Amino acid sequence: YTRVVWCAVGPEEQKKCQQWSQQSGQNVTCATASTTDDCIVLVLKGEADALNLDGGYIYTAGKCGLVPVLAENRKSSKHSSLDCVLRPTEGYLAVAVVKKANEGLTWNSLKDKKSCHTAVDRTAGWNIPMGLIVNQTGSCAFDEFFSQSCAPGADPKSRLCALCAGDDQGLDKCVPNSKEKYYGYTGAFRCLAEDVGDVAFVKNDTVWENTNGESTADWAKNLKREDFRLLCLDGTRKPVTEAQSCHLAVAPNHAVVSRSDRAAHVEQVLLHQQALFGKNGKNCPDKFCLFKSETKNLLFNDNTECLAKLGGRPTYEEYLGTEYVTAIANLKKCSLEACAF
Ligand SMILES: *[C@@H]1O[C@H](CO)[C@@H](O[C@@H]2O[C@H](CO)[C@@H](O[C@@H]3O[C@H](CO)[C@@H](O)[C@H](O)[C@@H]3O)[C@H](O)[C@H]2NC(C)=O)[C@H](O)[C@H]1NC(C)=O
Ligand SMILES: *[C@@H]1O[C@H](CO)[C@@H](O[C@@H]2O[C@H](CO)[C@@H](O[C@H]3O[C@H](CO)[C@@H](O)[C@H](O)[C@@H]3O)[C@H](O)[C@H]2NC(C)=O)[C@H](O)[C@H]1NC(C)=O
Ligand SMILES: *[C@@H]1O[C@H](CO)[C@@H](O[C@@H]2O[C@H](CO)[C@@H](O)[C@H](O)[C@H]2NC(C)=O)[C@H](O)[C@H]1NC(C)=O
Ligand SMILES: CS(=O)(=O)Nc1ccc([N+](=O)[O-])cc1Oc1ccccc1
Ligand SMILES: [Fe+3]
Ligand SMILES: [Zn+2]
Ligand SMILES: [Zn+2]
C-alpha cells in the first residue's frame, strides 16, 4: 500500500482527479499531461502509475512494455448471476453515424465529405474507419480522403483539423484532450449533431447516451434518435437500433494500464477504490462517484458499471485480440518492433 499516481489528460480530468485524490485520503494522487502520449511517457519514467486507455493507445503503450490491468465493464445481459468484476468484457460497437436528413449518403459516398473523428490513434474514431478506408482505396493517402475533418492530434494547420473548434476561446484547436470542443466520443458526435461534419465515427453507446433526453447538454437536449442513421459496410443505412447488424467492427473495452512491475499494486488499490466510489460504492453518490463526470467521460467512461479483473493474465496483444492487432499494424505501415518513445 503506497499511493497510486493517476495520470490525468487535460485540465478537466485533472480537476476530477484532484477531487478523487481529496476523497481518497491521498491514497490516489494525480499527475497531469496535455496528451495521452505524454501520460504514457510519465508512466514509463515512473512519475505516474496508471491511466485508463482506449484500445488504440493500449497498443502504443504495450509496445513500450505497459500492461493492461483492469478493463471497463458496462451493462449486459449474458452471465446474469456473475458479478461485474468477474464478468467477461463484451467489447463495444464501432459505428459510422450520419443525419437522416442527409439522404443518399452511404459508406460508398464518403469521399470528399466531412468527418468527425474522436482523436487520431483511437479505436472507433481513427483506427477502424481509416483502416477500412485505406484497405478499400488501396492507398495510404488517408490525409486526402475527406475534404475536411476534425481529428484531434493531427497537424493543426492540415485538413484533418479544419473542422476542430478548439476551446471556448479558440485556443488549443485540435489538441487530443477534452479541451477540444469536438474531442472524444461525445465531441465527435456533437460535431455531427451541429452539422459541422457529415459523419462521426464513435461507438453505438454514444448515440443512445446523447439523444432523446438522455443528456441535458444544450447541444443535445433536443436531439432525436430517429434523426440519425448508421452506415453499414454493405452500402445500406439502418436505424441506430440495428447496431448489432450494422457496425464497422467490435472494439475491445477501454482498460487501465501500468508498468508491469507496478500492476499488482495498482490493481489492489483500484478494486478498493471502486468499492468506495463505484456504481454502488459506499461513498457514491453521497460524496464522489468515480464513473460520473456528466456525459463528459472523464478518466473513465460515464457508462462504466465497474472495472473488471481481466483473467488469463493477458499480454496487451491478447487483450486487444489478434484481428485488431493486425488491423493496427497494417494501418501503421502507412505513416514493427520498437517503442515509439
Ligand atoms: C448501443 O448502446 C446502447 C446504450 O449504450 C445499448 O442499449 C441499452 O440496452 C441495455 C441492455 O440491453 C439496457 O441496459 C439495461 O439496464 C436495465 C436497467 O433498467 C436492465 O433492465 C437491463 O438488464 C439492461 O442491462 C439499456 O437500458 C439500453 N440503453 C439505453 C440508453 O437505452 C446497446 O447495448 C448498444 N447496442 C449495440 C447493438 O451495441
Ligand atoms: C483490411 O484488409 C487487410 C488485408 O486484407 C486486413 O488485414 C488482415 O487482417 C486479417 C484478420 O486480422 C488477417 O487475415 C488472416 O486470416 C485468418 C483470419 O484472421 C488468420 O488466421 C490468418 O493468419 C491471416 O493472417 C491478415 O493477416 C491481415 N492482412 C495482412 C496484410 O496481414 C484487415 O483486417 C482489413 N481491415 C479491416 C478494418 O477490416
Ligand atoms: C487508504 O488505503 C488504506 C490501505 O488500503 C486503507 O486503510 C485500510 O483500511 C482497511 C479497512 O479495514 C484495512 O483492511 C487495511 O488494513 C487498512 N490498511 C492499512 C494497513 O493501513 C484506507 O481505507 C484507504 N482510504 C481510502 C479513503 O481509500
Ligand atoms: C484469443 S485472443 O488472444 O484474445 N485474440 C483474439 C480475440 C478476439 C477475436 N475475435 O475475432 O473476436 C480474435 C482473436 O485472435 C484471432 C483472430 C483470427 C484468427 C486467429 C486468432
Ligand atoms: Fe474507444
Ligand atoms: Zn461484426
Ligand atoms: Zn496468455
UniProtKB/Swiss-Prot annotation:
Disulfide bonds, paired cysteine numbers: C7-C39, C17-C30, C64-C339, C84-C306, C116-C191, C140-C334, C150-C164, C161-C174, C232-C246, C284-C289
Glycosylated residues, chain numbering: N27, N135, N204
Locations listed in the record: Secreted; Cytoplasmic granule
Binding positions for Fe(3+) 2 per the UniProt entry: D54, Y92, Y185, H254
Modification after translation: Poly-N-acetyllactosaminic carbohydrate moiety seems to be needed for TLR4 activation.
Residue ranges constituting the Transferrin-like domain according to the UniProt record: 4-333
Superkingdom as given in the UniProt entry: Eukaryota
Family, similarity comment: Belongs to the transferrin family.
Subunit structure: Monomer. Found in a complex with LTF, CLU, EPPIN and SEMG1. Found in a complex with MPO and LTF; interacts directly with CP, allows Fe(3+) incorporation into LTF and activation of CP ferroxidase activity.
Protein name (database record): Lactotransferrin
Gene designation per UniProt: LTF
